[PDB]
Design a protein around this ligand. Structure first.
Ligand SMILES: CCCCCCCC/C=C\CCCCCCCC(=O)O[C@H](COC(=O)CCCCCCCCCCCCCCC)COP(=O)([O-])OCC[N+](C)(C)C
Ligand SMILES: CCCCCCCC/C=C\CCCCCCCC(=O)O[C@H](COC(=O)CCCCCCCCCCCCCCC)COP(=O)([O-])OCC[N+](C)(C)C
Ligand SMILES: CC(C)CCC[C@@H](C)[C@H]1CC[C@H]2[C@@H]3CC=C4C[C@@H](O)CC[C@]4(C)[C@H]3CC[C@]12C
Ligand SMILES: CC(C)CCC[C@@H](C)[C@H]1CC[C@H]2[C@@H]3CC=C4C[C@@H](O)CC[C@]4(C)[C@H]3CC[C@]12C
Ligand SMILES: CC(C)CCC[C@@H](C)[C@H]1CC[C@H]2[C@@H]3CC=C4C[C@@H](O)CC[C@]4(C)[C@H]3CC[C@]12C
Lengths: 52, 447
């Protein structure tokens, strides 16, 4: 069911989907490093506990 | 041999919940003496649960977990509602809980006294679930090695807490609440740590050959788990005050900060790695339910598919992942444990009710294991007891959960039972499907 392997191996035309899938894979790691930077900002600017 | 069977099941059951839930049972049981009794009671409930699943895991034997049994006992709508509950409630919420315990323990050494900032705990929980989603998408050959390793850290951290507890005694109680309401939330918090046996217990039958030896592996192993859980709680109670253990979101780091001096590099690391292993394991083992649920025709055809250069089940991981990441909208970790527990035990109720209804409806169906009816007729009532109290002790969590269940009836009719005939609708469904296929580069599995 759906489009099979034997079709999809030629539907991946490089100017469209291959460049698109490169862009989304970069956007994920850019966005996850964004979320890592966001978490590191919160941990740096949150107020540290007073020592006992 | 049976002795090596127990070493597979005990390492499967022990989990990461033991690093969350001590604070949970203590908050509801009020004082240590009753918290240890609840840990034992959770053990005994798991022994009765596991042997009923030794029966279902050998009578019906169909692959894919509880859904595979629901197809025989109920079919049709109740089988889809099990799959829908398990993919939108159970498997998301237990991943988020373990991803968040990871996050609090990884952060807690930067916040030794004051509570770790929730807005940061939730981002670092998310960073863990996305990173392990990416690793499971890129390579089963890598994500297997990530599972093989950190199962050692799980037991290393948990044994270290006990041996530190023993030297604390070598150098060296009332039960202040007793409301049935709270004691069901104590039982939910304690039962969470045992919560492996309904998913995987049948795996041991592929190496322990006689069917009467599978009950022996259960009956030997779950007392060993109960012993470890009681001993770790004694390690806390012989080191920490009730007024400390209720204040800390990561209780083993308090205990580690007391004894070790090198504290930062030990309990936070070894417990953290155990939870990084447990999030990884829940992703890696998820695909089975999507393959089965789409093969048996309940679940959309795209979620079956695989990325053919890497043989990894990309659309099923991405759906698993995004459901886990929405639980970041929840308020508190023990809110989500209550929520998970209600629907988990309500699913186990439907399964064990089903087993007795099946023993009535189709007698002597060649059962390799046949437990005494005296066990299920207590156990079904114990599932009902937990649920029946929880309807009124925790109404709002059940309300949003039953709102999820009732939202399954539309997609059952539209997706499976009504089989809506319009050709424009079918071409729209097809267009949506091939868009995803082209945008993820994914293909069907070999039928
Ligand atoms: C709603 C969000 C839906 C987005 C679906 C597209 C995601 C990108 C995608 O599939 O690219 C795919 C990869 O994607 C990944 O492997 C990234 C990790 C998976 C995404 C994690 C969860 C995202 C949650 C929010 C594209 O794969 P590809 O370019 O066809 O081949 C990749 C080949 N190498 C690089 C692995 C050799
Ligand atoms: C995620 C949401 C899950 C919805 C579940 C609904 C029931 C399943 C069902 O048959 O309905 C689907 C609703 O799914 C859709 O319309 C979405 C399709 C594009 C993505 C119909 O889509 P389908 O692919 O025809 O699903 C049946 C697949 N087999 C059994 C024919 C293989
Ligand atoms: C919406 C679907 C597609 C999921 C993909 C989007 C991801 C990146 C979203 C989903 C839910 C989001 C989280 C939801 C809530 C919170 C709590 C808040 O105090 C800080 C941000 C944080 C922790 C968000 C971070 C980003 C997040 C994880
Ligand atoms: C699963 C992955 C993504 C977890 C990542 C957790 C991140 C947010 C944590 C782990 C270790 C942390 C760092 C450890 C120590 C310090 C020194 C302190 O003076 C400032 C914060 C800083 C610099 C932390 C920033 C946040 C940090 C990088
Ligand atoms: C087919 C797919 C796309 C369906 C998506 C359903 C999503 C939006 C649902 C299913 C389960 C839901 C969660 C169930 C429980 C709670 C606890 C509550 O106190 C806050 C909201 C929160 C955290 C919900 C957020 C939304 C949620 C993640």
């Amino acid at each position: 069911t759906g489009l099979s392997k034997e079709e999809l191996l030629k539907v991946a035309g490089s100017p469209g989907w291959v460049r698109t899938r490169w862009a989304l894979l970069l956007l994920f790691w850019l966005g996850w490093l964004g979320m890592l930077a966001g978490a590191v900002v919160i941990i740096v600017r949150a107020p540290r506990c007073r020592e006992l | 041999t049976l002795l090596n069977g127990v070493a597979i099941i005990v390492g499967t059951i022990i989990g990461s919940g033991i690093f969350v839930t001590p604070t949970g049972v203590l908050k509801e049981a009020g004082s240590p003496g009753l918290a240890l009794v609840v840990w034992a009671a959770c053990g005994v409930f798991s022994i009765v649960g596991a042997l009923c699943y030794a029966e279902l895991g050998t009578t019906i034997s169909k692959s894919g977990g509880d859904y595979a049994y629901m197809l025989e006992v109920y079919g049709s709508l109740p089988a889809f509602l099990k799959l829908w509950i398990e993919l939108l409630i159970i498997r998301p919420s237990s991943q988020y809980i373990v991803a968040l315990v990871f996050a609090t323990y990884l952060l807690k050494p930067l916040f030794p006294t004051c509570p770790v900032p929730e807005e940061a705990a939730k981002l670092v929980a998310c960073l863990c679930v996305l990173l392990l989603t990416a690793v499971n998408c890129y390579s089963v050959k890598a994500a297997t090695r990530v599972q093989d390793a950190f199962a050692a850290a799980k037991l290393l951290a948990l044994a270290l807490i006990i041996l530190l507890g023993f030297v604390q005694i070598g150098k060296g109680f009332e039960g202040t609440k007793l409301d049935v309401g709270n004691i069901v939330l104590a039982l939910y918090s304690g039962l969470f740590a045992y919560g492996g046996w309904n998913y995987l217990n049948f795996v041991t039958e592929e190496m322990i050959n006689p069917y009467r030896n599978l009950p022996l592996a259960i009956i030997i192993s779950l007392p060993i788990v109960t012993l470890v859980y009681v001993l770790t709680n004694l390690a806390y109670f012989t080191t920490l005050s009730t007024e400390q253990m209720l204040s800390s979101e990561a209780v083993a780091v308090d205990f580690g900060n007391y004894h070790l001096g090198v504290m930062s590099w030990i309990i936070p690391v070894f417990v953290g790695l155990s939870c990084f292993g447990s999030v990884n394991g829940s992703l890696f083992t998820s695909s089975r339910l999507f393959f089965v649920g789409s093969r048996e025709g309940h679940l959309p055809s795209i979620l079956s598919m695989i990325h053919p250069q890497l043989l990894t089940p990309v659309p099923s991981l991405v759906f698993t992942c995004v459901m886990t990441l929405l639980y970041a909208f929840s308020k508190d970790i023990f809110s989500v444990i209550n929520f998970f527990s209600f629907f988990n035990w309500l699913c186990v109720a439907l399964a064990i009710i089903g087993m007795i209804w099946l023993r009535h409806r189709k007698p002597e169906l060649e059962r390799p294991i046949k437990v005494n009816l005296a066990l299920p007729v207590f156990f079904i009532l114990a599932c009902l007891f937990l649920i029946a109290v929880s309807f009124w002790k925790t109404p709002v969590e059940c309300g949003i959960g039953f709102t999820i269940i009732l939202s399954g009836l539309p997609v059952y009719f539209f997706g499976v039972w009504w089989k809506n005939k319009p050709k424009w609708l079918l071409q729209g469904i097809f267009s949506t499907t091939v868009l995803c296929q082209k945008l993820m580069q994914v293909v069907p599995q070999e039928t």
